[PDB]
Amino acid sequence: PLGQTVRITCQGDSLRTYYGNWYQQKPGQAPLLVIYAFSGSISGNTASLTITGAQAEDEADYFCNSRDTTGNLWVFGGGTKLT
Amino acid sequence: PLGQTVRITCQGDSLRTYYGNWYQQKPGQAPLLVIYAFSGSISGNTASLTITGAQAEDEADYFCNSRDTTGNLWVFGGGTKLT
Amino acid sequence: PLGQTVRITCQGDSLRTYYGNWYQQKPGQAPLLVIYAFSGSISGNTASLTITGAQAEDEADYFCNSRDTTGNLWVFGGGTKLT
Amino acid sequence: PLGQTVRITCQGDSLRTYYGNWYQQKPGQAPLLVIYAFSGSISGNTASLTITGAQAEDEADYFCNSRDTTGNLWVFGGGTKLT
Amino acid sequence: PLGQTVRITCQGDSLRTYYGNWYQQKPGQAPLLVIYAFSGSISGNTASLTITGAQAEDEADYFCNSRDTTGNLWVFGGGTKLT
Amino acid sequence: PLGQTVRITCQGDSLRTYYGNWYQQKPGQAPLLVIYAFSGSISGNTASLTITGAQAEDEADYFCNSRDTTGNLWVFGGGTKLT
């Protein structure tokens, strides 16, 4: 029995608040599963931002708090009652 | 029994609030599953933003909190009562 | 028994609030499953935005909180009562 | 029984508050699973930001606090009652 | 029984507050699992930032406090009651 | 029984507050698991920052305080009641 498991809960950036400009170049997010085997530019853009009044009375955030049961072959997830 | 499992709950950015300009270049999000085997530009754009009054009394956020049961071959998910 | 499983709950960006301009170049979101085997531009656009009064008394958000049972061959999902 | 497990709860940056400009080049986030085996530029952009009034009375944040049960072959997750 | 386990709770930077400009070049975040086996530039960008009024009465942050049970072969996670 | 375990709770920088400019070059964060076996530049950028009023009455931070049970072969995590 051979198996190759990759569990990633978030491949990304996790924020409660972002004010401003975000220049982002993230070419690859592609899982390549193989059993037998970027000149992109962000250029000359103008970004003008002004936040004068902001009130954020927010409640709690729950990001990437997983409860999974992952693997290969026999996987029993959650409150599996087995007899 | 061979198997190759990739479980990703979010491949993306997770935010409660974003104010502003987002320049984003994310070419690849394609899982390639193979058993036997970008000159794009964002350029010269003008972005003018002004938020004067903002009130955000928001409630809680639950992002990417999975409960899955993933794998290959035998997978029993949730409260599977087995006898 | 061989099998190749990719489970992705979100391939995308997950937000409660976005105010502003979003320049987005995401060429590929295509799962390619093969057993035997972008000069696009966003340019010169003008974006003028002004939010003066905003009140957002919102309730809770539940994003990408999956409960799936995924795999190959034998998959028993949810509260499968088996005897 | 051979197996190769990679569990990553967050591959990304985790913040409660970000004010400002973010130049980000993150080419690779692609798990490559193989049993037998970037000239991109952010250039000349202008970013003008001003936050005058900000009040953020926010509640608690729970980022990347996973409860998973990951692996290969036999995986029993959560409060599995086994007899 | 051979197995190779890598458990990383955060591969990223974890902050409660960030004010300013972030130039970031992080090419590789790709777990490569193999059983048998960057000229990118951020250049000439102008970043102007001014935060005059900021009040942040925030609540507690819980970052990367995992409770997982990870490994290869037999993995029993959480309060598994076994008899 | 052979196994090779790497448990890293944070591969990243952990801060409560950051004011200023961050030039960051972190090429590699990729766990390479193999059983049988960067000319990037940040150059000429201008960063202007001014924080005049800042008040941060924040609550406690809990960063990288894990409770995991990691390994290879037999792993029993949390308050596993075994008989």
Residue numbers in the entry:
A (entry chain C), B (entry chain B), C (entry chain A), D (entry chain D), E (entry chain E), F (entry chain F): 13 to 49, 61 to 106
Please, what does the article write about this entry?
Systemic AL amyloidosis is one of the most frequently diagnosed forms of systemic amyloidosis.
Comparison of the mutant patients’ sequences with the non-mutated GL segments led to the identification of six amino acid changes in the fibril proteins of patients FOR005 and FOR103, and fourteen in the fibril protein from patient FOR010. Analysis of the isolated fibrils with platinum side shadowing and scanning electron microscopy (SEM) shows that FOR010 amyloid fibrils are left-hand twisted, similar to FOR005 fibrils. The dominant fibril morphology from each sample was structurally reconstructed to a spatial resolution of 2.92 Å (FOR103) and 2.25 Å (FOR010), based on the 0.143 Fourier-shell correlation (FSC) criterion. The reconstructed three-dimensional (3D) maps were fitted with molecular models that depict polar and C1-helical fibril structures that consist of single stacks of fibril proteins or protofilaments, similar to FOR005 fibrils. There is only one mutational change in the analysed fibril structures that would intuitively be anticipated to favour the observed fibril protein fold. This mutation (H96L) affects a buried position of the FOR010 fibril, where it replaces a charged residue with a hydrophobic one.
